[PDB]
């Protein structure tokens, strides 16, 4: 009776197994544009990603994620609130069952219909491993994605998820330029939080863009369709694998821009 995102294992059954889920760093958090305090100091992102060597795609049972060659700085986060090298390792979506819900974050409560999460982990503690024991050892990017034209540079990872429908399916995928991925604009909003999802450690430093991308009703559809089950167990459809925004608490929301 591991967590999920049903009824019985969902959200809110999470603290039992992981106190921290009451913590105070939590997230997602609910994105208050006018209580967000610019702040001048913030240097503008970098995003270097044209060495990304991209090597598998795999169904966790909780989403899919892309993972990525993390033995160089290969793709890299520097820049923004960050103080040195952030390495990127993999990267998911959290979406849901309708176009009006899916997103984890919302912007004066707005959600939109899916959010993409690109981990990365300070390169001075040597590993992902070691980097979730600080506090300042990951840097998440999240990204929201709206539904009207579709997205190019998405139709590569939507076309395989066939092959990985169920739990604990794994294929090799490489050569994904994660670029495609990436709206025009990145200014951003930043604060500390938390994985969003078990463990729920809080070392991660969130950088959240305010350009949504766009991606089309079928190329969404088709997240939609894979299992939360794995073997050949009742289908479940993996859709709503997002957490409700959690308190602010003692926290502030910082913008990159005004
Ligand atoms: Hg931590
Ligand atoms: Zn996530």
Redesign the pocket.
Same mark, same amino acid.
């Given at each position: 009776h591991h967590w999920g995102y049903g009824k019985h294992n969902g959200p809110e059954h999470w603290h039992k197994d992981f106190p921290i889920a009451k913590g105070e760093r939590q997230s997602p958090v609910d994105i208050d544009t006018h209580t967000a305090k610019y702040d001048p100091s913030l240097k503008p992102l970098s995003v270097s990603y044209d060495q990304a060597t991209s090597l598998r795609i795999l169904n966790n049972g909780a989403?899919f994620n892309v993972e990525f060659d993390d033995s160089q700085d290969k793709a890299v986060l520097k820049g923004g609130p960050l103080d040195g090298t952030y390495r990127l390792i993999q990267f $998911?979506? $959290?979406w849901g069952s309708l176009d009006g819900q899916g997103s +984890?974050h919302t912007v004066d409560k707005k959600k939109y219909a899916a +959010?993409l $999460?690109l @981990?990365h982990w300070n390169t001075k503690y040597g590993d992902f491993g070691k980097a979730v024991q600080q506090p300042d050892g990951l840097a @998440?990017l999240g990204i929201f994605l709206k539904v009207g034209s579709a997205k190019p540079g998405l139709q590569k990872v939507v076309d395989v998820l066939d092959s990985i429908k169920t739990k604990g399916k794994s294929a090799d995928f490489t050569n994904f330029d994660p670029r495609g991925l990436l709206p025009e604009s990145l200014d951003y909003w930043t604060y500390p939080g938390s994985? /969003? /999802?078990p463990p729920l450690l809080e070392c991660v430093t969130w950088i959240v863009l305010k350009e949504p991308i766009s991606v089309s009703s079928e190329q969404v559809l088709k997240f939609r369709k894979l299992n939360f089950n794995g073997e050949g167990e009742p289908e479940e459809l993996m859709v709503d694998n997002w957490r409700p925004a959690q308190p602010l608490k003692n926290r502030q929301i910082k913008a990159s821009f005004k």
């Amino acid at each position: 009776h591991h967590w999920g995102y049903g009824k019985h294992n969902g959200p809110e059954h999470w603290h039992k197994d992981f106190p921290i889920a009451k913590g105070e760093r939590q997230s997602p958090v609910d994105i208050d544009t006018h209580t967000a305090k610019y702040d001048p100091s913030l240097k503008p992102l970098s995003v270097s990603y044209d060495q990304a060597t991209s090597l598998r795609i795999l169904n966790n049972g909780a989403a899919f994620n892309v993972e990525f060659d993390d033995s160089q700085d290969k793709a890299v986060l520097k820049g923004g609130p960050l103080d040195g090298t952030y390495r990127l390792i993999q990267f $998911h979506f $959290h979406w849901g069952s309708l176009d009006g819900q899916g997103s +984890e974050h919302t912007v004066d409560k707005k959600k939109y219909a899916a +959010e993409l $999460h690109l @981990v990365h982990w300070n390169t001075k503690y040597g590993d992902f491993g070691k980097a979730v024991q600080q506090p300042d050892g990951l840097a @998440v990017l999240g990204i929201f994605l709206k539904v009207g034209s579709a997205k190019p540079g998405l139709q590569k990872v939507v076309d395989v998820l066939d092959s990985i429908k169920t739990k604990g399916k794994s294929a090799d995928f490489t050569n994904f330029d994660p670029r495609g991925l990436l709206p025009e604009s990145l200014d951003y909003w930043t604060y500390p939080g938390s994985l /969003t /999802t078990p463990p729920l450690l809080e070392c991660v430093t969130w950088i959240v863009l305010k350009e949504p991308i766009s991606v089309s009703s079928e190329q969404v559809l088709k997240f939609r369709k894979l299992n939360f089950n794995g073997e050949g167990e009742p289908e479940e459809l993996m859709v709503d694998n997002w957490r409700p925004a959690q308190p602010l608490k003692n926290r502030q929301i910082k913008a990159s821009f005004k």
